[PDB]
Structures are given as structure tokens and as C-alpha cells.
Amino acid sequence: DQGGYGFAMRLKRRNWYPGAEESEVKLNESDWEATGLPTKPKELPKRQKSVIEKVETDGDSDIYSSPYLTPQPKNQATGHENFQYVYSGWFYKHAASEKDFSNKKIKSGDDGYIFYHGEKPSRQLPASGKVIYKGVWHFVTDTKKGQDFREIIQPSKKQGDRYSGFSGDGSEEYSNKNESTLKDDHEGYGFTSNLEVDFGNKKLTGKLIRNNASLDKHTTQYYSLDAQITGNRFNGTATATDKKENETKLHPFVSDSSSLSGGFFGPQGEELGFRFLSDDQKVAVVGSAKTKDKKLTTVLDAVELTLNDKKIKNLDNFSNAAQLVVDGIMIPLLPKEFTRKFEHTPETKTYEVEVCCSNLNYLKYGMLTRKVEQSMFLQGERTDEKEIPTDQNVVYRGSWYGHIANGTSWSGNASDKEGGNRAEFTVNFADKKITGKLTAENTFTIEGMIQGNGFEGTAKTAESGFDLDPKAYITDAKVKGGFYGPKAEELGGWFAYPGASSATVVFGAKRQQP
Amino acid sequence: DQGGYGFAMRLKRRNWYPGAEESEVKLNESDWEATGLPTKPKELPKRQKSVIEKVETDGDSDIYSSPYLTPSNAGNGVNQPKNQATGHENFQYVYSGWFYKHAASEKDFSNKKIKSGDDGYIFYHGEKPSRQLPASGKVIYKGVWHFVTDTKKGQDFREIIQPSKKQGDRYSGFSGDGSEEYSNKNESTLKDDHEGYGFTSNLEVDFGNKKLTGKLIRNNASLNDKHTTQYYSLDAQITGNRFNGTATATDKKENETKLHPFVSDSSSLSGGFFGPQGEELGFRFLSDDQKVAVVGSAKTKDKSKLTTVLDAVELTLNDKKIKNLDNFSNAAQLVVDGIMIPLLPEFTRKFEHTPETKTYEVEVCCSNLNYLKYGMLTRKVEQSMFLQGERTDEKEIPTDQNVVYRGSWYGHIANGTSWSGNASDKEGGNRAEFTVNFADKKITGKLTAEQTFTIEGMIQGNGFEGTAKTAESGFDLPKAYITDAKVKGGFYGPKAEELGGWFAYPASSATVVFGAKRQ
Ligand code: NA
């Protein structure tokens, strides 16, 4: 979707002051909150935790949270419990009532959040095969006067009416979360998720169930899931398994959702997080799942090349070339005209960014400066390896940002004109062969082999030295890159030297046509 | 208990008018209704049926009832459910079950009343309460049982009734609800450990020790390993043709959360035996927490020395004929024409009574008798004598070889003109005396008007039989003559503190009831 490390949704409490009563408080897409990057996924998300810390109590000040979270119920899919990258769950307080009679506000009930968050969003995934993910899921409901969800939460405290139904409520007493052993057909403890991810076809399906207390089949299914995978993200729908027919509907899971979204985390996407909001705005869900406890394709490139030390770091990215993720904050690259330039301060003081180009849509590259640090960056969404064209002669044209020196330093931005930085590449896909040239003043020569949706080769200053306007002699510099966008219209790469002349360069070119 | 042909309990519907809402409606002992004696036990009880007939509907007017019941005066759909204990299904004397309508909602805003849900009854009723039972042995009875619950806001019983319509909250949970979908009542074959279809009862009656035990279970839908669920065990003492005791909720746990209503014991199990030798029975109870009422019925296997537990007879004057009366093992409760006439509000007594034959006139004796009552009964005009008593257990029959009993008798005799004489304590009026040799199984005595009769007989178990005769000589009012009068009687109360009997004849007639007390 619009990408992020995580999302949280707060419980609602309904005003029941007589004469100024809200009959209902619905959930809204706008209610979703970003969590930010967690240092430790097992801990509560910091922004929302701080909110709850300040929530007033009167008799019980503790924060209660999902049992596997960092402060004897269980909530886990057996064989799939050792999360390292992604956590979902809930936390709350027995919040004091708001009793503001002269402003006509009375509110009572728990206050808290459901959430998921993760670290290390994936840049590679299995190339093929169907893989089973299991884990947990959580929910929070709207509030409506007279409403109860007695099938899921015993309504002695007006859960669903005065404050949201949620999966952490003390009266959620129909799951097996407190039992000591499992029935033969239980998937685990409490509310659990089961997803089948088809990396071959870039899609996934799943089921969200409750494992039922034993006091006849022991689970109940509330949703099935369907989603398309794009890069490290996925988007789709949730289908309510029991909606309204012969029943008056004793639970909140009665409407489909068209807003299922999530993403993969970890080295090869072995964990995932997701959320959705029901179309009738009655229920929000978050969840997490992982491969069983213990060949790849690359879906994106996102790198930072630091000048001062010529070093190259991987950046996080949510499979969106136009969204630059640095230091856990998200910097957009298009203003909701070749190249571009601007600065940005969140909430390092400010970020200065120069980005190219206007004609590129799956690939962005340029300059990044913190304040003072300076780096180049490149990020792109790789084309599916199965979409790599077979054409034997393909020309790409564009530019590049350059920083090089054997004595004094030369720096040159990218440009469309005139004798400024220019790049050209000819690719023989059939041969798995790639070559091209970068010129400043009319010089590097690059040979490489294509592998899947990526390439790898060398860049040399040739013979001998370059200019510095003193000869810089770079030869056998490792060059890595990729093809971005559908059907590989855009391509990009970078190189650092060494692995008395230095060099750091990002470049990107666009495909032509007869 | 207090005896009767049957009992019914109505479903509750909770008021949910906002602002005037009942959060709960509990069941009460006072909610039990007498059914009266059914002409045909397979039919619905008439009083309660009439109530349900008048219950308003708006879309579906049918009365739904237990599958083995007579639809009678009422229809169905998607229907072949069963509710039966296999091998024990051919009831003739006693039926239990339920009947109901999809009642219209009461929508009376102007009286702040909103009520919705089914309206109906559970019940059992029987005919021919037993005057004899097997003398000994343990006997298996099986059958069915039914329940109705209280109503409470937010409450559901999802383990027994799928709560889509707020069963247990807006209207009573009950065993006939359309959403009782977890029993096997609709299945076509039985698992090998099912006792039958739907909710069934299993009782072991120990006639030797005058007690019984039992189990009430559900036979579960097959949707490995066991296919029934037990909700109660039962324990009761038998007294005459009645039994009383307790029900014990099988799963009350402690910690709950209790998805069914059967969570509390009951100290009010009561029922009775029906049929020639008590081969069928009916029972009811109300849970101590007033959350559930149960009724049921059971019978010996579908197709033995007997003991007599009571005598209850009517001797009609005009035709000198003798009919058995129904009785619920209670000497002080006179049951005639299906209605119950109490006999205690001073020797003898007299009074009249009209139920709801115009009125009944009764003269009853005596004040010192507690397991035996006898006197005059008149309908309006018909006239009869009656006697009824609770027999002493044959095993309690004393061995004493010389025992005197003293009392009186009511007399009606004539060879020409008629002589009638009430019973009395004094003076030369009717007086009776008996000497009994239990060891000899021998009994004799005399009735005198002041002239007399003389009775002799032998003793079989807890009853006696023999003959009575005038002096002949003759009698008074002019003389009447009696010879070889057929005499029947019994011993009543613990260790036979009491005894009584009667005779009819058969140009002289005679009809006499008598009762005496031990000295
Ligand atoms: Na009755």
C-alpha cells in the first residue's frame, strides 16, 4: 500500500452522558496510526505506548499486553511461534472513566491499541513454491449503544457498547488461550492465522480462526484472505466467513474488507504483518505470521553510498521507488522539471535530497545530505525475473551522479543536457550481456552478466587515469545493478571504489523504442 | 409432594421495553400448573392447550409439539425428529413433552411492554396412578425429559441452543426450540453408545428398598468417541405410588463459564407411578437457583409378584356397586372425577366443595386416623360411601399375636325398608372392634348398631379378606338379613396402627365401610 513499519489502532470509548450521548462510534481508515521502526519488535510500539502511559487510571495502573510481548494465557500457532522480525498484539489499561458532567462527557472502559510492527522489510523472497505461514491475529471493534458480541466476549461490562470489543478483553473467555493442552484439531492457542503464500504466482490465501475452549470440532473460522503480492508488499481482501443469514450475528466479523494490506519482513520474507478494516467499519484486524520455526529472487534495490568513507549501506524500502526510507522516517520523492531538489524535516535536523529523474517511475536516484553528512542513493523495484525481455539489442539512455578524486575532487550532478553527465547502455538479454558508458566531459566502461532481474560486472576508467577537471586510475571496480519496472524499461546500478583515486557513482537509464 | 395427574410450566418472555426492562425473569415453584387428568395421555393437556390456542401469532399460527404427541386440533415442516429411549417408547399411561407457537411479539408501548419469542409449555401428565407395584427387585425405566429455563439479559446457552434468536435472554431456553441443534434428534441411525434420540432419561427403580436413581442425558449429533452428555443424576425415596428427592447437576464445575443451564442441584424432584403395576412414571423438578425446570417420563421395556400400596374405593348405594378411585398415596386427599378434594381443613367431619356434577357433599371419618379416611360422598343426586388408606409396607407388618383395634363404620342396609347409620365415637351408635393375630395371619371383629355384624377373615400380606353377617335374628328397620357378605380390607400406616375395610351385598342388601385404630 502506502508502506510502513507498522500500524496501530486505538480502542474507542463511547460518550454516554445522558442527553449528549453518541449512539455509535465507528472505526475509520484515518484512525490507523504508524508505529515507526521498532528497535525490538517484541516491545510495544513507542509512540502508542507513551499515549497509554499517560492514560489516567484509578485503582489499577498496569499495562496489560499479549503474553509473548515484553512487559498464563497463550496466543500462538504451534510450530510457528519464534518471531524475530514482526510482532502483532495488543496492550491496554483498565482506564479510569471520564466523568466530565459540565461538558457532558461520560466515557468508561478499557483504553489501548492493537498493532503490528516489524523490522527489516524484505528485499528478497523465495523465487518459487507455496509456503505455509502461521501466526496470530487481533481485532478491535466499533462501539454502538445496545450492541454486544457475546459469542466472543461475555458482555458483563458492555464490551462493544461503551468501549470497543477487542481480543485482549478480560472477558474473551471462549478461546482455549488458558488451557493446558491442545485438541487434535486445534491450530494453537487463542486467535490464530494460517496463510498459504504462493511465491511462484505472486499471490496468497489464508484463514483467520479462533481455537475454541473445550468444555465436535474445536476451531471457528471468521475470515478467509486473498491477496496479490507486489514486491515485498501484498494487497487484497478479507472475506467474512459467517456474515448475516439465519443468525442475528453475535460477533463482529460480519462484513468483508477490501483493504487487506501487509508486507514481508526478514532476510527472505520468512515473516509477515498485515491489517484490514471491515467495509462496514465495525472491525479492524491486525496480524502476523511466519514460516515454520527452525532459491531467492531480489525484489528491490535500495542503497546509500556514503561519500566520506565511500561505503555502501542497504536502505529499508517498502517496494516503492518514490518513497525514500532513511533513519526510520519516510521521505516522499514526488510533490503531491528534470531531476528535482528539496529538503524535509520530520515531526539529524533536516534532510536535503536531490532526486532523478522525472521520466523514471520504478527507479529513483540522487543525492542525500543530513545535518553534515552526504551520500548518494538509489532505489528501484525490480522487474519479475519471469518478465525479463528476450530482446538481443536494447538501448537505454539517462544520466548519473558522480563523485571521484585522485587528488582534488570532482562532483557532477545528473542532467538531461548538455555535455553534462550522460549515460548509455546496450543490453543483450538473450546473451545475458550488458554494456554501456558514462561520460562527464566526453568516462567509464561497464561489462556485465545479467542474472535474473539483476546484473553484475565491472567499471573501468580505462587508459589511463581520467581527468580531474592528475589522472585517476580505476580498474576492475565491482558494479551491481538491476532492471526495474514491468518488462524492464528502467535499469540502474552503482559502484564503490575501492572495495590514490576514489569513486562513488549512481546511475539510471530508460529504455528506448523503434 | 401434594399429588396430581400432571404438571406444566410455561415459557417466559422478558420485557425489553427500553427504560422499563426486566433484566431477568426467574422460574418459581408457583409457576407450576396442574394439568388435570387426560382422557388421552398422547394429547396435549387441555387447560394449557387452550391458553396456547389463544396466544396471538402473526405469520405462523401452528402449534408445534413433541414428535410422539398427537398433533390433534397444529402442523409442521421439515419434520421427522425423534425423541425416544430405544426399547422404551410405547407409552400408554404417561406422556411428557412440549408444545409452542412462534408467538407474535407484544409491542405495547403504551403499557411499556415489549416481549418477543416462542410461547408454550413443557408438561407431563398421566392416567391411572398405580395402586400396586412390584413387591421387589430393581427395574430399569427409560424415557425422555424436557426443560425450560429462566430469561436473563445477556445470557445464552449456546451449548444446547444456538443463540441467534436470543434464546435464554428474550425468551426461555427450552428443549423444543428450533435451534436445539446439537442432539441427534434428526439423525437416521444411532451410534452404538446412544441411548436413543434427543434428550433421554434412564432410571433404576429399586422396589425392594423403596428407592430410585437415574441419569438425564442428551444423545449428541454426530457432526470417536462418546456420543452422549450427562446433565443430571437423580435420587429419590418411594412412598406408595409417589417418589420425592433430589437432582444433582452433573457438570456445575466451579470456575464456569457454563454454556448450558444445568448448573444447579434441585431439592424438589417429585413424581409418581402410573399403570396397573407402575410400569410407567412421570416426574418434575425445579433447580434451586430457579434457572431451569425439568419434566420427564419413563417406562419399563416395551413388550412378578405385586404388593398393594393403597386402597381407594367408592361404594355406590343405588346399585351397591364398588369402583376403584384414583389416589396419589394420600389418605387425606380424595380424588373423584379428576378433581382433588382435601379432607382436612371434631370427630368425623362434614362439608361440601365445588371445583373451579355441581357440588360434592362429603362426610369423613375420623379425626384420630391419619393414614385412613372413610365416609359418605354425594354428587348433585348420587350417593356413595368411600374408603381410602395408605397400606403399610408388607415388611412392616407386625408379628404380634393379639392386637385390638377400635373404631366405627358407616352402614346402609335393607331387606325391606332401609337402615342408614353414620359412624361415631359414641354412644350406642356405630362401633367396631377387631382382634388381629398377625402371627396366625388371622383377623376377626364385630360391627354393632346396638343389631350387629360380625366379621371374620384371614390376612394376606398387608390386606385382609373375609365375610360379615347380621345376627339373623335380623337387623333394625322390621329386620334385615346378611349372610356371607364379601369383605375386603387392609392395614394402613407404619406397623399397621390402622385398619379398615368395606363390604357390599350382594331380599336384603348392604354396603358398609369401616375403619379401626390400634390400641
Ligand atoms: Na392434576
Curated annotation (Swiss-Prot), chain B:
Biased composition (Polar residues): 63-85
GO CC aspect terms: cell outer membrane; cell surface
Organism the protein comes from: Neisseria meningitidis serogroup B
Subcellular locations according to the entry: Cell outer membrane; Cell surface
InterPro entries (alphabetical): OMP/PagP_b-brl, TbpB_B_D, TbpB_C-lobe, TbpB_C-lobe_sf, TbpB_N-lobe, TbpB_N-lobe_sf
Superkingdom of the organism of origin: Bacteria
Entry protein name: Transferrin-binding protein B
Induction: By iron starvation.
Membrane topology term: Lipid-anchor
Stated family: Belongs to the TbpB family. Isotype II subfamily.
Lineage: Bacteria, Pseudomonadati, Pseudomonadota, Betaproteobacteria, Neisseriales
Basic and acidic residues compositional bias, start-end: 40-49, 347-356
Biological function: Neisseria acquires iron by extracting it from serum transferrin (TF) in its human host. Acts as a TF receptor and is required for TF utilization. Involved in the initial capture of TF. Helps select only those TF molecules that can be used as an iron source and concentrates them on the cell surface, maintaining the iron-loaded status of the TF C-terminal lobe until its delivery to TbpA.
Signal listed as a keyword: yes
Chief site of localization: membrane
